[PDB]
Amino acid sequence: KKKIEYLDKTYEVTVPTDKIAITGSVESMEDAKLLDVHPQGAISFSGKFPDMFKDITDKAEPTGEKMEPNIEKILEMKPDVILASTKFPEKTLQKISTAGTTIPVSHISSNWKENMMLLAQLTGKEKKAKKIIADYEQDLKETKTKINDKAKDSKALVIRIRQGNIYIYPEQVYFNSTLYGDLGLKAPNEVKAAKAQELISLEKLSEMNPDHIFVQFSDDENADKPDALKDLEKNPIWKSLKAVKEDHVYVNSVDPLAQGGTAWSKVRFLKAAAEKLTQNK
Numbered sequence: 481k482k483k484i485e486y487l488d489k490t491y492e493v494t495v496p497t498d499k500i501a502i503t504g505s506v507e508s509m510e511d512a513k514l515l516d517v518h519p520q521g522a523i524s525f526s527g528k529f530p531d532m533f534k535d536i537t538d539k540a541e542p543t544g545e546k547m548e549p550n551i552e553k554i555l556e557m558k559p560d561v562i563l564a565s566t567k568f569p570e571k572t573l574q575k576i577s578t579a580g581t582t583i584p585v586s587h588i589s590s591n592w593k594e595n596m597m598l599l600a601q602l603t604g605k606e607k608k609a610k611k612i613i614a615d616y617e618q619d620l621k622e623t624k625t626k627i628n629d630k631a632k633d634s635k636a637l638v639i640r641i642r643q644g645n646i647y648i649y650p651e652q653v654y655f656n657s658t659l660y661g662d663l664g665l666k667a668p669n670e671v672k673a674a675k676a677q678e679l680i681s682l683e684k685l686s687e688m689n690p691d692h693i694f695v696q697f698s699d700d701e702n703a704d705k706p707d708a709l710k711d712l713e714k715n716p717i718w719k720s721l722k723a724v725k726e727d728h729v730y731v732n733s734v735d736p737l738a739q740g741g742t743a744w745s746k747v748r749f750l751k752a753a754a755e756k757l758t759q760n761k
């Protein structure tokens with residue numbers, strides 16, 4: 481049993497352990513994917529494990545849907561450690577802590593290394609994590625010099641459509657740490673002023689008038705309004721967008737269930753973003 485430090489809080493956990501239950505932290509599912517960690521408990525999406533996670537969920541029971549942990553089922557698992565999420569309200573984190581030692585994994589994308597390092601420390605995979613991290617940084621380094629200086633000066637936006645609504649995120653959240661931080665594009669004022677995931681109207685978006693828009697849309701997250709995207713696409717206000725008219729809308733260039741603040745989300749978005757913002761004469 482070892483004392484693990486994660487974001488200035490220490491936790492006492494048997495290390496290494498196979499008995500890890502992930503609930504809420506889709507970030508940790510993505511870290512588990514690249515570290516080849518097969519958790520005892522994993523997050524279900526619309527009741528199943530996505531094909532992209534099937535290699536690591538072969539020993540997993542579902543811990544519940546992302547935002548609806550099943551405390552009873554997690555209790556039944558008797559896990560060594562629970563990887564929860566900082567997005568959970570305190571009430572829910574505390575309910576989860578009755579099942580075992582609970583570490584809320586950060587949804588702040590600037591903590592991607594720390595999140596990976598935590599899972600590595602739990603599984604004794606520190607070397608493997610170091611390599612994944614260093615390969616992203618080399619990848620970023622080579623991709624950057626390829627990125628064209630016109631696109632760098634441009635106004636680009638990442639939006640995610642949930643329950644029919646359009647959301648934006650802070651500068652250090654979701655894919656934005658890669659778009660504005662790593663790639664160096666200028667965050668729009670609306671992103672800079674955002675304090676968390678926040679609703680933006682199509683009407684307001686028409687005023688922002690970005691040069692490029694990455695739209696993330698998961699059918700699982702839009703059960704009420706499954707036409708949310710096709711509805712937007714037929715809307716005269718959407719059709720007035722510079723990005724739309726210039727064919728600079730990129731729908732799901734990364735899987736819509738990707739969370740942004742993880743090694744795996746970063747490498748994917750880096751590649752997709754570089755694709756859309758490169759050229760040749």
Ligand SMILES: O=C(N[C@H]1COC(=O)[C@@H](NC(=O)c2cccc(O)c2O)COC(=O)[C@@H](NC(=O)c2cccc(O)c2O)COC1=O)c1cccc(O)c1O
Nearest residue numbers: 504546547565567568569587642643649653654676677701
């Ligand atoms: O800033 C983010 N949230 C804010 C703001 O998000 C919201 O207010 C709402 N939210 C969605 O409707 C949402 C609809 C469909 C899908 C959603 O994910 C929704 O969030 C409600 O969620 C919640 O109230 C709470 N939330 C979870 O419990 C959760 C638990 C586990 C896992 C979660 O994702 C959770 O939200 C807390 O939400 C927040 O603090 C935020 C950022 C980056 C990425 C996020 O996902 C964020 O939510």
Ligand SMILES: [Fe+3]
Nearest residue numbers: 546547567677
């Ligand atoms: Fe959320």
